[PDB]
């Protein structure tokens, strides 16, 4: 062992990493076939309908399958679609993971008057054009020379800037933001109960909603006059 | 009150309009369901799995037994999952669309002596470990230092902080990018020829590589360990 | 401009809304119809038991 | 003389890379009879084009 073990392990580590990557790639097609098929197979079988008569097999070609049996090009197409979906999903997941980051940039520029500096202002900003919006802070104002704006927050990511834009878009949603805020403020043993209630009883809830779904315009007519 | 008639008119108009939109939104889940169904119905034609044999639908099988009949919880759950996936895709699309917009900043950092305009360095000297993504540069240093730093420059790929600034996390990836460009840029009748050949014998070749690909893990570790 | 717009469009929108309201009112009926259809379903059919023999349909 | 003018055309067409003739042949396999069937109506169109260029 000793150094020879380490030298082999380095190559062994590379081989294991590559094999794991290839297995993950293959499984993503297999696993996606699994999920969606069970979606079709929730009360259903897995018999590949692409197994045509000119492909002699009783049922050997009948599970999210084709290899080369009869219809196989469309199975490859399904595999490619699954690969694209998996690529998109993993890209999104990595994007979120690097999005929190603690340190991702989120340099914001919105109208405000919050002050935290050393001996600041007494010249400040006097821009009477372009409304209250602020541009890149090299020196935002048309005539600003000693300008200094606001540094990125140790919270989240550009979601702050979007929320600033989003709050402009919607104000009723801003009011409901406290509602979801206190909803998430509930303890961890809240989401599980919510899921359990939504479990089973949720289809009945959608059923019951279907009645009021026709009645929804009538209900809106009240607030419409309001 | 002829004008007031007009008001109630516009109100009920908005009413029916939102009604339809909903209908369109609900169909969008059903539309995606049909789309993926055809994806599965590449081989298949039409079926709803839950439909029991002892059922008036029987020959009526698609979404006919997704909730009103037979398999309700799982089929409706699949519909809800598809709707959630569609909503997530829509959110991603909106985020991608808002990319090239206004108030779009990357707020990046890189070491250089360039300046957008007349910038006096005044012996700008204060360095630190990890020059990229240094302190806020609000003249946050042992002294002020007469600092001028980067605004949010007007260019595409605002998230270049990862594309190039964090590209140092994998230098070989940058090296492979030159190799990617080397592979690219051939004659116009090169990508088309590759596509035609791949469509011609892609299945046979992929089968040909099957165990060779499994056998590939053996090699290129020993070569390094040599 | 010769664009009448105004009342001519207003009457047309009124007719469309009235048709929609009539459809909704009738649905309310068939809406309760199918909610009581839900009442009898979970394994229940809906055929006309009365309209079985004494009808040429 | 006009043959020489078209000679450079064929010279550069066949002057393409080796992976051009195979694609052309494969197209000929798939299209030849189908192309003949499609262009059969064009024969009546061909007299119309000849008449058009006749005045030109």
Swiss-Prot record, chains A, B:
Biotech relevance: Systematic vaccination of individuals at risk of exposure to the virus has been the main method of controlling the morbidity and mortality associated with hepatitis B. The first hepatitis B vaccine was manufactured by the purification and inactivation of HBsAg obtained from the plasma of chronic hepatitis B virus carriers. The vaccine is now produced by recombinant DNA techniques and expression of the S isoform in yeast cells. The pre-S region do not seem to induce strong enough antigenic response.
Topological region Intravirion: 29-79, 196-201
Glycan-linked positions: 146
Source organism, top-level taxon: Viruses
Spans traversing the lipid bilayer: 8-28, 80-100, 175-195, 202-224
Keywords recorded for this protein, A-Z: Acetylation, Caveolin-mediated endocytosis of virus by host, Fusion of virus membrane with host endosomal membrane, Fusion of virus membrane with host membrane, Glycoprotein, Host-virus interaction, Lipoprotein, Membrane, Myristate, Transmembrane, Transmembrane helix, Viral attachment to host cell, Viral envelope protein, Viral penetration into host cytoplasm, Virion, Virus endocytosis by host, Virus entry into host cell
Primary localization: virion
A GO-annotated cellular component: viral envelope
Subcellular localization, as worded in the UniProt entry: Virion membrane
GO biological process, one term: fusion of virus membrane with host endosome membrane
Ranges of the Virion surface topological domain: 101-174, 225-226
Post-translational events: Isoform M is N-terminally acetylated by host at a ratio of 90%, and N-glycosylated by host at the pre-S2 region. Myristoylated.
Family membership: Belongs to the orthohepadnavirus major surface antigen family.
Protein's job: The large envelope protein exists in two topological conformations, one which is termed 'external' or Le-HBsAg and the other 'internal' or Li-HBsAg. In its external conformation the protein attaches the virus to cell receptors and thereby initiating infection. This interaction determines the species specificity and liver tropism. This attachment induces virion internalization predominantly through caveolin-mediated endocytosis. The large envelope protein also assures fusion between virion membrane and endosomal membrane. The middle envelope protein plays an important role in the budding of the virion. It is involved in the induction of budding in a nucleocapsid independent way. In this process the majority of envelope proteins bud to form subviral lipoprotein particles of 22 nm of diameter that do not contain a nucleocapsid.
Domain-related comment: The large envelope protein is synthesized with the pre-S region at the cytosolic side of the endoplasmic reticulum and, hence will be within the virion after budding. Therefore the pre-S region is not N-glycosylated. Later a post-translational translocation of N-terminal pre-S and TM1 domains occur in about 50% of proteins at the virion surface. These molecules change their topology by an unknown mechanism, resulting in exposure of pre-S region at virion surface.
Name of protein: Large envelope protein
Organism of this sequence: Hepatitis B virus genotype C subtype ayw (isolate China/Tibet127/2002)
Shown chain mapped onto the complete sequence: 175 to 400 of 400
């Amino acid at each position: 062992m000793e150094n020879i073990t380490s030298g082999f392990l380095g190559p062994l580590l590379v081989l294991q990493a590559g094999f794991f990557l290839l297995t993950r790639i293959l499984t993503i097609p297999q696993s996606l076939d699994s999920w969606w098929t069970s979606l079709n197979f929730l009360g259903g079988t897995t018999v590949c309908l692409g197994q045509n008569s000119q492909s002699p097999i009783s049922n050997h070609s009948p599970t999210s399958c084709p290899p080369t049996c009869p219809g196989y090009r469309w199975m490859c197409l399904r595999r490619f679609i699954i690969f694209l979906f998996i690529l998109l999903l993993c890209l999104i997941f990595l994007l979120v993971l690097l999005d929190y980051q603690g340190m991702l940039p989120v340099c914001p520029l919105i109208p405000g008057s919050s002050t935290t500096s050393t001996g600041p202002c007494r010249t400040c900003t006097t821009p009477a054009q372009g409304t209250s919006m602020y541009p890149s802070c090299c020196c935002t104002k048309p005539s600003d020379g000693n300008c200094t704006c606001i540094p990125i927050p140790s919270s989240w990511a550009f979601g702050k800037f979007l929320w600033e834009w989003a709050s402009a878009r919607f104000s009723w949603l801003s009011l409901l933001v406290p509602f979801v805020q206190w909803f998430v403020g509930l303890s961890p043993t809240v989401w599980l109960s919510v899921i359990w209630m939504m479990w089973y009883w949720g289809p009945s809830l959608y059923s019951i909603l279907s009645p009021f779904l026709p009645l929804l315009p009538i209900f809106f007519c009240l607030w419409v006059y309001i």
